[PDB]
Amino acid sequence: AKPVLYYFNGRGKMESIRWLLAAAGVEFEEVFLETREQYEKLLQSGILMFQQVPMVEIDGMKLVQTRAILNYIAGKYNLYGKDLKERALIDMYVGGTDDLMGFLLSFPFLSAEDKVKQCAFVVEKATSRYFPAYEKVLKDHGQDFLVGNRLSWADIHLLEAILMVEEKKSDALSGFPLLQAFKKRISSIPTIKKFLAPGSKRKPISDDKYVETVRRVLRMYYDVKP
Amino acid sequence: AKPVLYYFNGRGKMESIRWLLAAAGVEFEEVFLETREQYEKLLQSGILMFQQVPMVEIDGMKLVQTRAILNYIAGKYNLYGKDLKERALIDMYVGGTDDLMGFLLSFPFLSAEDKVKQCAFVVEKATSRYFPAYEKVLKDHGQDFLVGNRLSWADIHLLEAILMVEEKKSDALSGFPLLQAFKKRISSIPTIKKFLAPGSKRKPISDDKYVETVRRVLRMYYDVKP
Ligand SMILES: N[C@@H](CCC(=O)N[C@@H](CS)C(=O)NCC(=O)O)C(=O)O
Numbered sequence: 001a002k003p004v005l006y007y008f009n010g011r012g013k014m015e016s017i018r019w020l021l022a023a024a025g026v027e028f029e030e031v032f033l034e035t036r037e038q039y040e041k042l043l044q045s046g047i048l049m050f051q052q053v054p055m056v057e058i059d060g061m062k063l064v065q066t067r068a069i070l071n072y073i074a075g076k077y078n079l080y081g082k083d084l085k086e087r088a089l090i091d092m093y094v095g096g097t098d099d100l101m102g103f104l105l106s107f108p109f110l111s112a113e114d115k116v117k118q119c120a121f122v123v124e125k126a127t128s129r130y131f132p133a134y135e136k137v138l139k140d141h142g143q144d145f146l147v148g149n150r151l152s153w154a155d156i157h158l159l160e161a162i163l164m165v166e167e168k169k170s171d172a173l174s175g176f177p178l179l180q181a182f183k184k185r186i187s188s189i190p191t192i193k194k195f196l197a198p199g200s201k202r203k204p205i206s207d208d209k210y211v212e213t214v215r216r217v218l219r220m221y222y223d224v225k226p
Numbered sequence: 227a228k229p230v231l232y233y234f235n236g237r238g239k240m241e242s243i244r245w246l247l248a249a250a251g252v253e254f255e256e257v258f259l260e261t262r263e264q265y266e267k268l269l270q271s272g273i274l275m276f277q278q279v280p281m282v283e284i285d286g287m288k289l290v291q292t293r294a295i296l297n298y299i300a301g302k303y304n305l306y307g308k309d310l311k312e313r314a315l316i317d318m319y320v321g322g323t324d325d326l327m328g329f330l331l332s333f334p335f336l337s338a339e340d341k342v343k344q345c346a347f348v349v350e351k352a353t354s355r356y357f358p359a360y361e362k363v364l365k366d367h368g369q370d371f372l373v374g375n376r377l378s379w380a381d382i383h384l385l386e387a388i389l390m391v392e393e394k395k396s397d398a399l400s401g402f403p404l405l406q407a408f409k410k411r412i413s414s415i416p417t418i419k420k421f422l423a424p425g426s427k428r429k430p431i432s433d434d435k436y437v438e439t440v441r442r443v444l445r446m447y448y449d450v451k452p
């Protein structure tokens with residue numbers, strides 16, 4: 001049966017999972033949490049090991065913990081390298097883009113003033129720390145992909161991160177020619193091109209409606225700081 | 227050559243790595259960051275992909291990102307299950323204890339008042355969310371170990387987490403009989419017993435000296451909130 005993604009109708013921590021499944025050409029279904037009662041019913045069913053989402057029903061498992069879910073999908077669909085060392089490189093690269101996109105998780109919950117500050121913080125991290133690191137990886141081996149000269153989860157996570165940064169600062173990739181070429185190549189891969197196309201399950205930049213729903217369902221995150 | 231752990235002379239994010247290596251019976255060396263100049267020299271050498279530590283020199287790699295390092299060690303020393311699904315369970319369990327211990331990372335940098343609040347926050351999470359979840363895993367299959375009826379990284383991460391919670395609230399495991407038995411069994415495993423014994427490389431609860439050193443080296447974390 002198709003994987004079922006339990007989360008809010010928005011990006012959050014589930015977006016990277018949507019990306020990986022789409023990139024692997026895997027059709028999935030989604031169950032959106034829209035009300036407090038719906039969440040309480042979930043808690044009572046005990047299907048959320050730690051009372052939290054993301055949660056993905058896949059291959060008989062009720063998998064929680066974002067990274068555990070991604071690790072599983074990457075491995076199942078051969079996007080995790082060919083051995084222990086390649087997986088280590090993929091994990092190291094993913095850790096970097098996970099931190100980068102992680103700095104944007106609170107963004108929609110921030111005040112107008114903090115959004116400006118956070119945006120500057122994220123762009124600075126991208127241009128001074130992360131983009132230089134990945135540009136160097138590509139420059140050092142000169143291959144089209146980050147690891148093993150073939151598409152991996154690391155490439156998919158980086159493309160998503162690059163797009164999120166560009167949504168905040170359109171010219172953020174300026175000065176990183178290899179990443180620019182990388183962006184075009186990965187975006188053209190059939191499964192990925194389809195995901196970036198209209199009508200896909202890719203979610204938009206989070207808005208006030210998303211925040212309102214998260215707060216209504218979880219009764220939390222009422223005062224987020226940068 | 228033996229793995230080399232680059233970090234501060236204290237727990238932080240490197241402690242779990244020390245635990246896993248010790249549990250696997252692997253002898254390692256440590257390089258402690260004590261001065262700003264030492265850190266600047268590291269940055270200039272480019273050995274830290276994202277300008278941060280933990281960093282572990284192992285099998286020819288300059289591995290950064292805590293989870294990437296742990297994933298590698300767990301896999302290399304057969305403490306990651308026997309297949310994709312067992313790894314998924316291990317990752318899900320580890321995610322929970324990583325979050326739990328993660329809530330304690332800022333603790334030594336907190337004010338006296340915030341430490342009291344944070345301690346209450348952590349204990350509540352342990353008794354209402356995490357301990358119940360792991361107690362249930364053990365209860366459901368009745369085996370001595372969390373996954374595959376053999377020692378895994380998940381068991382090691384949970385034991386460490388249990389001990390950290392008990393350091394904050396000694397009777398926190400009360401009401402969780404299976405976890406109590408689990409604590410005694412895992413603590414008795416030769417490699418682990420040795421790590422818990424005097425003279426090991428296990429690090430103590432972080433103190434003001436640790437905080438002072440982190441702030442001196444990184445010139446950051448000057449005002450941490452709960
Ligand atoms: N470490 C978990 C964290 C999950 C998490 O923080 N989930 C939030 C929603 S984005 C949640 O369920 N919050 C409710 C709560 O913690 O009580 C992961 O990576 O999946």
Ligand SMILES: N[C@@H](CCC(=O)N[C@@H](CS)C(=O)NCC(=O)O)C(=O)O
Binds near residue numbers: 277293
């Ligand atoms: N996601 C990274 C985070 C590493 C991290 O936050 N490292 C801190 C020390 S505990 C650091 O190097 N901070 C300096 C900085 O970020 O500039 C990991 O899990 O290893």
